[PDB]
Amino acid sequence: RGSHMCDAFVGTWKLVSSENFDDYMKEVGVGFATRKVAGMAKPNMIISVNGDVITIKSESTFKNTEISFILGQEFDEVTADDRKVKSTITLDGGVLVHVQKWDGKSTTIKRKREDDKLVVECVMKGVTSTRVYERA
Ligand SMILES: COc1ccc(S(=O)(=O)NCCCCC(=O)O)c2ccccc12
């Protein structure tokens, strides 16, 4: 197999900035103690691609997570904050668009390459948080 456009996400990334994540988590419904501890985390994210399967791992002092998925194909995800959600991730104009659905609610997480950074934009009900990762 040769290159894929998604290979631009592949690598080891470290969180360097976070804006409005507490308010985003509030909107998602995250409880106090989880918000405080999760908010402190400075995770590393490892993204790899193997055939049609994309894997996103996150390692931090808060929680270690891993999701593997095929674009456009819904999967079960247990989030860092312990929600059990139905997730679908697609590629739209170079941007990984990740929708999580649970308990009649929905949130969208966009991951995109900007310069040498990987920018993560999380949106829930008018509230947006921006998290920026750099190469590790
Ligand atoms: C470190 O704490 C978290 C990580 C990921 C998630 S998530 O379910 O994967 N949605 C956010 C995804 C992008 C954030 C990031 O990877 O830096 C959390 C969701 C709610 C509260 C805390 C979360």
Curated annotation (Swiss-Prot):
Protein name: Fatty acid-binding protein, adipocyte
Record has Acetylation as a keyword: yes
Location of Phosphotyrosine modifications: Y24
GO biological process: brown fat cell differentiation; cellular response to lithium ion; cellular response to tumor necrosis factor; cholesterol homeostasis; fatty acid transport; long-chain fatty acid transport; negative regulation of DNA-templated transcription; positive regulation of cold-induced thermogenesis
Job of this protein: Lipid transport protein in adipocytes. Binds both long chain fatty acids and retinoic acid. Delivers long-chain fatty acids and retinoic acid to their cognate receptors in the nucleus.
Free-text note regarding domains: Forms a beta-barrel structure that accommodates hydrophobic ligands in its interior.
GO cellular component: cytoplasm; cytosol; extracellular exosome; lipid droplet; nucleus
Organism, as annotated: Homo sapiens
SUPFAM superfamilies in alphabetical order: Lipocalins
Binding site for a fatty acid: R131, V132, Y133
Entry superkingdom: Eukaryota
Lineage of origin: Eukaryota, Metazoa, Chordata, Craniata, Vertebrata
One Gene Ontology molecular-function label: hormone receptor binding
